[PDB]
Design a protein around this ligand. Sequence first.
Ligand code: HEM
Length: 146
Amino acid sequence: SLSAAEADLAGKSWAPVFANKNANGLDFLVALFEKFPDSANFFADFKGKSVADIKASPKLRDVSSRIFTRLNEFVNNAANAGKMSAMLSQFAKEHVGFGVGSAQFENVRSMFPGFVASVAAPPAGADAAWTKLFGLIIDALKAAGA
Ligand code: HEM
């Protein structure tokens, strides 16, 4: 886990993003696919398709939402190793099932801070809190076999 301090910083930077959940959740998903095109392949309707096709999809919102709703729960529990344990196991177990592994989260990690910053400048130290949090995610993926 993260320390309460770290956790606070991550929450603080997240607040503005989550404020506009629907629009921001969609933008995050699109930004990922733009920066890391290979990632669209892990999704049926999105593979073959262009970012423009994705943006136009009636499925976008359902996909990106689930992502934001879970991230929010990770942000909430970050400083409680216990909750994280369980959350991390279940998250990795689910992704590996789909063929997604840490390399994909290394990508998320890479572009995350920049994404948050495009919404509102984060507090000092928030960038490191997210990398740490994504770190926890990457490690869980590696333990789950990918
Ligand atoms: C930012 C971190 C991410 C969060 C918190 C997250 C969260 C989620 C959640 C909670 C589900 C289950 C949705 C449901 O209830 O049906 C899910 C499904 C899945 N995720 Fe992630 N995800 C993230 C990153 C990624 C990445 C990077 C990829 C691919 C590169 C990935 C690919 C998938 C796939 C293929 C599914 C299966 C669901 C489907 O077929 O639509 N996710 N993820």
